[PDB]
């Protein structure tokens, strides 16, 4: 897709390939519509259903960094964490940091879950599929929480807790909060099939 516009004016959006065609529809990265200079846009997302699938993904990651009250709405701080984070990713991997995140989104999103449904008149938790958009939403959620928990009461910085999280998650090692939370969800859901 055409356009030589880059995040923070350093990182190319071309040469990022999202493998799983399942959620290629909701990773707002690949098309030239989604390229943006900054992960900060005051777009009126959430206004309609599925509209937040159009929000550029690096912003969706950014939005989730602002939690637990003392971080709510502090988006300049949150985005600044993102810049340092991708500095560290290219520092440690020397690959496209955009590729790392979107591969970290794709490896750490549960494909199944258990919900309390009732067939025949009696309810209990039963195994179900997961829609792609909640899967992306869940993949973001796991990564950001895991980076958050480790940084707390740690000399380590959040930018680099986030960075270790994403590198390990994109590899797929059983080392991330996101990875272990993903697989326990699948294992439960598998059992209650």
């Amino acid at each position: 897709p055409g356009g030589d516009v880059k995040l923070f004016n350093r990182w190319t959006f071309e040469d990022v390939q999202v493998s799983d065609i399942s959620l290629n529809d909701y990773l707002a990265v690949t098309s030239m519509k989604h390229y943006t200079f900054l992960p900060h846009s005051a777009g009126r997302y959430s206004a309609k259903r599925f509209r937040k699938a159009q929000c550029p993904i690096i912003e969706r990651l950014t939005n989730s960094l602002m939690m637990h009250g003392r971080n709510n709405g502090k988006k300049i701080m949150a985005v600044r964490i993102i810049k340092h984070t991708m500095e560290i990713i290219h520092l440690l991997t020397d690959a496209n940091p955009i590729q790392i995140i979107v591969d970290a989104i794709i490896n750490s999103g549960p494909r199944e879950d258990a919900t309390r449904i009732g067939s025949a008149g009696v309810v209990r938790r039963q195994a179900v599929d997961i829609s792609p958009l909640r899967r992306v939403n869940q993949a973001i959620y796991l990564l950001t929480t895991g980076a958050r928990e480790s940084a707390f009461r740690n000399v380590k910085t959040i930018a680099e807790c986030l960075a270790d999280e994403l590198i390990n998650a994109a590899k797929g090692s059983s080392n991330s909060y996101a990875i272990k939370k993903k697989d326990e969800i699948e294992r439960v859901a598998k059992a209650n099939r």
């Binding site: 494909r111 449904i117 195994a127 599929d129 997961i130």
Partner: protein, 64 residues
């Protein structure tokens, strides 16, 4: 050994479950574009979305 198979939501049926938390959909298998079976999705899902399925034999019943 199950192989993760992909399907596409052709259409949406209802919102089952006690709390309504389960959209029931009809899926289209991509390996064989002939198998239209019911599945139960969690999360917002429209036609043209692609569901990852671990198993396939698990088939949802009507108004499940």
């Amino acid at each position: 050994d199950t192989q993760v198979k992909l399907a596409v939501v052709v259409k949406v049926m209802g919102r089952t479950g006690s709390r309504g938390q389960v959209t029931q959909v009809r899926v289209k298998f991509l390996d064989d574009q002939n198998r239209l079976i019911m599945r139960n999705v969690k999360g917002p899902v429209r036609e043209g979305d692609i569901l990852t399925l671990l198993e396939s034999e698990r088939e949802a019943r009507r108004l499940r």
